[PDB]
Structure formats: structure tokens, C-alpha cells
Tab-separated table of C-alpha atoms and ligand atoms in Angstrom:
chain	number	residue	atom	x	y	z
A	1	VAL	CA	23.991	41.246	28.044
A	2	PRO	CA	25.809	39.636	25.062
A	3	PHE	CA	24.206	36.653	23.256
A	4	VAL	CA	20.665	37.426	24.507
A	5	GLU	CA	19.379	37.741	20.898
A	6	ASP	CA	20.623	34.233	19.932
A	7	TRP	CA	18.225	31.309	19.632
A	8	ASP	CA	19.000	27.628	19.084
A	9	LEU	CA	16.444	25.875	16.875
A	10	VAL	CA	16.130	22.478	18.568
A	11	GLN	CA	12.985	20.672	17.281
A	12	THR	CA	10.385	20.808	14.470
A	13	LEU	CA	6.889	21.527	15.771
A	14	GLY	CA	5.013	21.297	12.442
A	15	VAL	CA	7.647	25.931	12.738
A	16	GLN	CA	10.615	25.258	15.071
A	17	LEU	CA	11.058	25.244	18.834
A	18	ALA	CA	13.686	27.931	19.543
A	19	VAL	CA	15.528	28.166	22.875
A	20	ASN	CA	17.347	31.324	23.941
A	21	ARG	CA	21.065	30.795	24.380
A	22	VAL	CA	21.182	32.941	27.552
A	23	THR	CA	17.764	32.805	29.221
A	24	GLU	CA	16.623	29.394	27.921
A	25	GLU	CA	13.221	30.930	27.123
A	26	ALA	CA	11.349	28.707	24.630
A	27	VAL	CA	9.490	30.302	21.711
A	28	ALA	CA	8.053	28.948	18.468
A	29	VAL	CA	9.624	30.343	15.315
A	30	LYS	CA	7.622	30.116	12.116
A	31	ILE	CA	9.944	30.003	9.127
A	32	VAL	CA	8.367	30.964	5.803
A	33	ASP	CA	10.555	31.021	2.684
A	34	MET	CA	8.862	33.582	0.430
A	35	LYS	CA	10.165	32.056	-2.851
A	36	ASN	CA	0.272	36.253	2.366
A	37	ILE	CA	2.768	36.314	5.225
A	38	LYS	CA	2.700	40.130	5.415
A	39	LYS	CA	-1.011	39.884	6.238
A	40	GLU	CA	-0.400	37.142	8.834
A	41	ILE	CA	2.242	39.342	10.498
A	42	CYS	CA	-0.087	42.365	10.337
A	43	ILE	CA	-2.913	40.490	11.994
A	44	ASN	CA	-0.545	38.916	14.567
A	45	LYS	CA	0.619	42.432	15.576
A	46	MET	CA	-2.983	43.212	16.602
A	47	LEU	CA	-3.388	40.248	18.979
A	48	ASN	CA	-3.102	40.293	22.788
A	49	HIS	CA	-5.139	37.671	24.602
A	50	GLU	CA	-4.456	34.766	26.933
A	51	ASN	CA	-6.287	32.338	24.630
A	52	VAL	CA	-4.530	33.500	21.418
A	53	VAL	CA	-0.945	32.518	20.552
A	54	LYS	CA	1.167	35.593	21.410
A	55	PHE	CA	3.288	37.258	18.721
A	56	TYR	CA	6.664	38.552	19.884
A	57	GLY	CA	7.958	40.081	16.652
A	58	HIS	CA	9.516	39.137	13.333
A	59	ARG	CA	12.809	39.377	11.456
A	60	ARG	CA	13.397	38.877	7.725
A	61	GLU	CA	16.703	37.734	6.238
A	62	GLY	CA	16.612	37.845	2.456
A	63	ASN	CA	13.708	35.639	1.386
A	64	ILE	CA	13.055	33.790	4.673
A	65	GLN	CA	10.604	35.401	7.125
A	66	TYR	CA	10.891	34.469	10.831
A	67	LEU	CA	7.846	34.978	13.087
A	68	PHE	CA	8.534	34.686	16.827
A	69	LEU	CA	5.488	33.216	18.539
A	70	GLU	CA	4.251	31.837	21.844
A	71	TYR	CA	5.441	28.283	22.470
A	72	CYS	CA	2.714	25.892	23.610
A	73	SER	CA	4.381	22.864	25.191
A	74	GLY	CA	1.136	20.857	25.528
A	75	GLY	CA	0.930	20.492	21.732
A	76	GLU	CA	-2.317	20.266	19.786
A	77	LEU	CA	-5.831	19.768	21.111
A	78	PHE	CA	-6.058	17.241	18.277
A	79	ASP	CA	-3.875	14.851	20.328
A	80	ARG	CA	-6.124	15.060	23.438
A	81	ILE	CA	-9.018	13.616	21.442
A	82	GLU	CA	-9.127	9.820	21.648
A	83	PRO	CA	-10.376	8.305	18.388
A	84	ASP	CA	-14.006	7.190	18.735
A	85	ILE	CA	-14.151	8.314	22.422
A	86	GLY	CA	-13.252	11.994	22.621
A	87	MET	CA	-12.353	13.159	26.119
A	88	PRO	CA	-13.984	13.619	29.502
A	89	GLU	CA	-16.913	16.063	29.323
A	90	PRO	CA	-15.460	18.379	31.987
A	91	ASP	CA	-12.197	18.717	30.000
A	92	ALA	CA	-14.164	19.402	26.794
A	93	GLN	CA	-16.261	22.079	28.516
A	94	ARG	CA	-13.152	23.800	29.898
A	95	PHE	CA	-11.479	23.771	26.484
A	96	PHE	CA	-14.742	25.055	24.938
A	97	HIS	CA	-14.885	27.909	27.470
A	98	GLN	CA	-11.336	28.932	26.552
A	99	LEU	CA	-12.048	28.615	22.828
A	100	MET	CA	-15.058	30.931	23.180
A	101	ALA	CA	-12.981	33.450	25.126
A	102	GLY	CA	-10.400	33.535	22.320
A	103	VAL	CA	-13.033	33.796	19.562
A	104	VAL	CA	-15.003	36.547	21.405
A	105	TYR	CA	-11.717	38.426	21.604
A	106	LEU	CA	-10.838	38.052	17.923
A	107	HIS	CA	-14.364	38.955	16.806
A	108	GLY	CA	-14.303	41.997	19.119
A	109	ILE	CA	-11.234	43.343	17.279
A	110	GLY	CA	-12.829	42.562	13.895
A	111	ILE	CA	-10.704	39.496	13.094
A	112	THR	CA	-11.984	36.125	11.854
A	113	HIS	CA	-9.668	33.065	12.083
A	114	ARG	CA	-11.475	31.068	9.307
A	115	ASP	CA	-9.777	27.730	10.070
A	116	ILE	CA	-10.643	26.728	13.629
A	117	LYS	CA	-9.917	23.047	14.189
A	118	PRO	CA	-8.124	20.960	16.820
A	119	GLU	CA	-4.819	21.096	14.859
A	120	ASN	CA	-4.808	24.903	15.308
A	121	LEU	CA	-5.818	24.925	18.984
A	122	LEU	CA	-2.682	24.605	21.095
A	123	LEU	CA	-2.204	23.925	24.768
A	124	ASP	CA	0.342	25.499	27.138
A	125	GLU	CA	2.005	23.673	30.072
A	126	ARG	CA	-1.143	24.251	32.190
A	127	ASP	CA	-3.425	22.982	29.375
A	128	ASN	CA	-4.686	26.476	28.606
A	129	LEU	CA	-5.972	26.646	25.028
A	130	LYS	CA	-4.456	29.066	22.526
A	131	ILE	CA	-5.799	29.780	19.033
A	132	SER	CA	-2.958	29.556	16.498
A	133	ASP	CA	-2.080	30.107	12.847
A	134	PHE	CA	-3.491	33.353	11.401
A	135	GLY	CA	-2.407	32.531	7.874
A	136	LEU	CA	-6.051	32.315	6.731
A	137	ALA	CA	-7.350	35.047	9.053
A	138	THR	CA	-8.901	38.269	7.785
A	139	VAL	CA	-10.575	41.526	8.808
A	140	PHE	CA	-14.371	41.371	8.799
A	141	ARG	CA	-15.048	44.641	10.683
A	142	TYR	CA	-13.177	47.919	10.299
A	143	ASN	CA	-14.224	51.383	11.465
A	144	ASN	CA	-17.301	49.709	12.966
A	145	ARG	CA	-18.405	48.568	9.521
A	146	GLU	CA	-18.824	44.860	8.693
A	147	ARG	CA	-17.461	43.403	5.452
A	148	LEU	CA	-19.124	40.261	4.125
A	149	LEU	CA	-16.770	37.447	3.170
A	150	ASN	CA	-16.722	35.629	-0.208
A	151	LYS	CA	-13.462	33.615	-0.332
A	152	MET	CA	-13.988	29.894	0.252
A	153	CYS	CA	-11.365	28.782	2.784
A	154	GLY	CA	-10.933	26.679	5.907
A	155	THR	CA	-11.107	22.859	6.186
A	156	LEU	CA	-14.101	20.993	4.746
A	157	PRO	CA	-15.280	18.966	7.809
A	158	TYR	CA	-15.182	22.208	9.867
A	159	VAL	CA	-16.633	24.665	7.307
A	160	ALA	CA	-20.139	26.099	7.665
A	161	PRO	CA	-22.715	25.154	5.013
A	162	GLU	CA	-23.235	28.751	3.813
A	163	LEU	CA	-19.614	28.886	2.612
A	164	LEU	CA	-20.510	26.100	0.115
A	165	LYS	CA	-23.925	27.502	-0.852
A	166	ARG	CA	-23.812	31.325	-0.884
A	167	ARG	CA	-21.678	33.869	-2.751
A	168	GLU	CA	-21.306	36.080	0.357
A	169	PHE	CA	-21.630	35.357	4.048
A	170	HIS	CA	-21.109	36.872	7.483
A	171	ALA	CA	-17.763	35.950	9.160
A	172	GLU	CA	-18.841	35.348	12.772
A	173	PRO	CA	-21.360	32.476	12.259
A	174	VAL	CA	-18.706	30.576	10.257
A	175	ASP	CA	-16.307	30.601	13.228
A	176	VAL	CA	-19.177	29.650	15.566
A	177	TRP	CA	-19.912	26.635	13.343
A	178	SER	CA	-16.303	25.416	13.334
A	179	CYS	CA	-16.250	25.706	17.161
A	180	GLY	CA	-19.335	23.401	17.212
A	181	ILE	CA	-17.574	20.783	15.073
A	182	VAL	CA	-14.582	21.043	17.450
A	183	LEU	CA	-16.966	20.464	20.382
A	184	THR	CA	-18.486	17.420	18.585
A	185	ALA	CA	-14.967	15.984	18.041
A	186	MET	CA	-14.030	16.576	21.722
A	187	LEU	CA	-17.183	14.777	22.908
A	188	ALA	CA	-17.338	11.894	20.350
A	189	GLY	CA	-13.772	11.435	18.982
A	190	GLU	CA	-15.145	11.605	15.449
A	191	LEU	CA	-16.142	14.216	12.901
A	192	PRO	CA	-19.838	14.152	11.989
A	193	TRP	CA	-19.458	14.577	8.207
A	194	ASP	CA	-16.971	15.034	5.348
A	195	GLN	CA	-18.675	18.380	4.604
A	196	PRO	CA	-22.053	20.053	5.294
A	197	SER	CA	-23.700	19.532	1.902
A	198	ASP	CA	-27.143	18.129	0.994
A	199	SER	CA	-25.223	15.482	-1.003
A	200	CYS	CA	-23.588	14.342	2.263
A	201	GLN	CA	-25.735	11.635	3.848
A	202	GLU	CA	-24.417	12.170	7.400
A	203	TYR	CA	-25.251	15.864	7.103
A	204	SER	CA	-28.771	15.041	5.806
A	205	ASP	CA	-29.247	12.688	8.781
A	206	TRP	CA	-28.362	15.519	11.202
A	207	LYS	CA	-30.822	17.879	9.495
A	208	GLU	CA	-33.462	15.127	9.930
A	209	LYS	CA	-32.616	14.957	13.675
A	210	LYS	CA	-31.444	11.326	13.679
A	211	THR	CA	-29.475	11.795	16.897
A	212	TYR	CA	-29.857	8.076	17.675
A	213	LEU	CA	-26.925	7.717	15.200
A	214	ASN	CA	-23.204	8.447	15.789
A	215	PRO	CA	-21.525	10.758	16.695
A	216	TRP	CA	-24.629	12.190	18.398
A	217	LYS	CA	-25.631	9.074	20.376
A	218	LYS	CA	-22.304	9.304	22.246
A	219	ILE	CA	-23.030	12.861	23.429
A	220	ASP	CA	-25.050	13.667	26.521
A	221	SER	CA	-28.391	15.438	26.047
A	222	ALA	CA	-27.109	18.691	27.641
A	223	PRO	CA	-24.109	19.334	25.322
A	224	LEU	CA	-26.126	17.849	22.443
A	225	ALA	CA	-28.804	20.532	22.968
A	226	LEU	CA	-26.058	23.177	22.554
A	227	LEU	CA	-24.837	21.477	19.378
A	228	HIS	CA	-28.436	21.591	18.042
A	229	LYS	CA	-28.244	25.408	18.418
A	230	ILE	CA	-24.752	25.787	16.880
A	231	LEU	CA	-24.983	23.370	13.913
A	232	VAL	CA	-27.992	25.173	12.419
A	233	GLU	CA	-27.892	25.441	8.589
A	234	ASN	CA	-29.235	29.016	8.361
A	235	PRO	CA	-26.403	31.241	9.694
A	236	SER	CA	-28.921	33.973	10.581
A	237	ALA	CA	-30.804	31.512	12.833
A	238	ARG	CA	-27.603	30.055	14.284
A	239	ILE	CA	-26.789	30.753	17.950
A	240	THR	CA	-24.456	33.670	18.604
A	241	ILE	CA	-21.668	33.637	21.150
A	242	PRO	CA	-23.480	35.876	23.683
A	243	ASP	CA	-26.277	33.249	23.661
A	244	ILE	CA	-23.812	30.296	23.797
A	245	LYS	CA	-22.666	31.898	27.088
A	246	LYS	CA	-26.264	31.580	28.411
A	247	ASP	CA	-26.549	27.910	27.428
A	248	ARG	CA	-27.427	25.416	30.152
A	249	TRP	CA	-24.572	23.006	29.429
A	250	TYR	CA	-22.089	25.883	28.969
A	251	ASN	CA	-22.924	26.951	32.560
A	252	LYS	CA	-23.139	23.444	34.103
A	253	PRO	CA	-20.646	22.829	36.936
A	254	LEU	CA	-18.563	19.810	35.866
A	255	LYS	CA	-14.828	20.277	36.507
A	256	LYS	CA	-12.744	20.703	39.636
A	257	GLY	CA	-9.732	23.057	39.611
A	258	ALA	CA	-6.172	21.893	38.830
B	1	LIG	N1	1.197	28.695	12.749
B	1	LIG	C1	1.589	28.436	13.819
B	1	LIG	C2	2.010	28.284	15.035
B	1	LIG	C3	2.244	27.020	15.613
B	1	LIG	C4	2.681	26.979	16.944
B	1	LIG	C5	2.872	28.164	17.649
B	1	LIG	C6	2.613	29.378	17.033
B	1	LIG	N2	2.182	29.409	15.765
B	1	LIG	N3	3.286	27.829	18.902
B	1	LIG	C7	3.358	26.472	18.986
B	1	LIG	N4	3.721	25.735	20.048
B	1	LIG	C8	3.732	24.400	19.936
B	1	LIG	C9	3.393	23.742	18.748
B	1	LIG	C10	3.409	22.244	18.789
B	1	LIG	C11	4.243	21.553	19.690
B	1	LIG	C12	4.230	20.162	19.752
B	1	LIG	C13	3.373	19.432	18.937
B	1	LIG	C14	2.524	20.100	18.055
B	1	LIG	C15	2.531	21.496	17.996
B	1	LIG	O1	1.688	22.096	17.108
B	1	LIG	C16	2.996	24.522	17.629
B	1	LIG	C17	2.994	25.917	17.781
């Protein structure tokens, strides 16, 4: 079939929406003028999960790299979060379930995302959540051997406190922490602090258990109890994903089917 390899770029997504000339299939094409991306492509080639943005392949033409990726027509989770309100608890729990599934998957293959936030969590036409953008992602386990991380990266309001305090740290608790900040945002429509430092008053308040303040006062006791287990300063004491899956709120029936 002639023309089947031709794509019309029709709209900027943040990354272009590309539509196939013949089939009308929509994909996202990430255009990166190399005048970093080799690692992103390498990691993307490893990924196959329903809650991770699918990678279809790539083509380079001179200096511009083109990554062909899963198109998520529901846009960013960020835009489902109403400022100062958040979203309905059942929607937040469903999104949180899907986020955990994606992160369990990545961690199982030894990959850490390192920049989980609502801007990077995309939604398909059925509002299924997809983890996107592996530009900051890295290998933390290879040949069944863990490598400790030392590079400071991510996004300050979402970063775990150990990344600011310690020279080296385990990868998995950092992604757990960012998922907790995402959950807070979904349930309160606000981020709890600028960054998790002892200099940050809102972070000190949390450590002193002042949950009569915002954002915490807006969050029901059940999800709040989970957040108390996730947003724990010591990453060794922090809840792991297998234990998140046993959490009372995590397992609370809330949401009807589509
Ligand atoms: N990096 C990155 C990246 C980014 C995307 C993607 C794959 N990778 N698929 C998408 N589908 C929709 C969107 C999108 C559409 C509308 C509004 C905001 C968006 O981020 C972004 C991506």
C-alpha cells in the first residue's frame, strides 16, 4: 500500500500530533533537534505496558530525531485537577490504581521515571492513565543488582526529601514519594509544599502532623492515612508499593464502571 508511511503533523501537543495519510491513525511524534535522546529511545524500546506510553519506533533525519509514540487524546492529568478542589475521590483512586500499575511495571524491569507529576501522566480516550516522557528516566537495577542514584533531578514540589539531603539514595522510594504528591494534588487541587526541606514551613507543619491545615484538611481520613505512610521522610521507613496495595483506602470500593 503506497503512502502508508506518510504522516501529517497537524497540532502541537507540548511533540506533535501526527495523522497517517492512509489509515488516519493518530500518533504523537516527539521532535528533538540534537544541535540524552539516545538513552530515552533505549529505555522506550524496553517498555510494553498498558499504563506506559507505547513507543512505536524512531527515525533520524540529519540532526532531528523523531520518536513515534502513543497518542493520548485525553491530554494531561494536570488538566483534570481543579485548582483548590482536586477531583472526585473515586476518579483519583482509579487514576492512582493505574499509576501504581505503571510504576510497578517500570520498577519490575529496573527502570525509574524520576519525574512523575500530573504533566507527565496522560489520559487516553477512555481516561486510562499512561506514564510519559522518559527523558529523565534511568536504570536502577541490572542483572538483578541495584544501583543507587546520585543525580539530583525531577521537579522540586514532587521530589523526595532524601534527594535534597543525601549523596546517594534508592530509586524506588523516590518514585513512590512523587506518586504521593500526585495523589495529594488529585485530592486537594494544591501542592503541599514548594519542596520537602526543613527550611520549608509547610513541610515542617506536615512533619509535625498539623493535618488540620490545608491541603490535608480537604482530604478524607482514609486517603489521608495512606498519604501519612507515603510522605514519610525516611525512605527506608516509607511504604513500599506491595504495601500500598494492601492499604485500606487503596482497596475501598468507590467507583462504578464506565
Ligand atoms: N515526552 C512525551 C510525550 C508526550 C505525549 C505522548 C508521548 N510522549 N503522547 C501524547 N499524547 C498527548 C499529549 C497531549 C495532548 C493534548 C494536551 C496535552 C498533551 O500532553 C502528549 C503526549
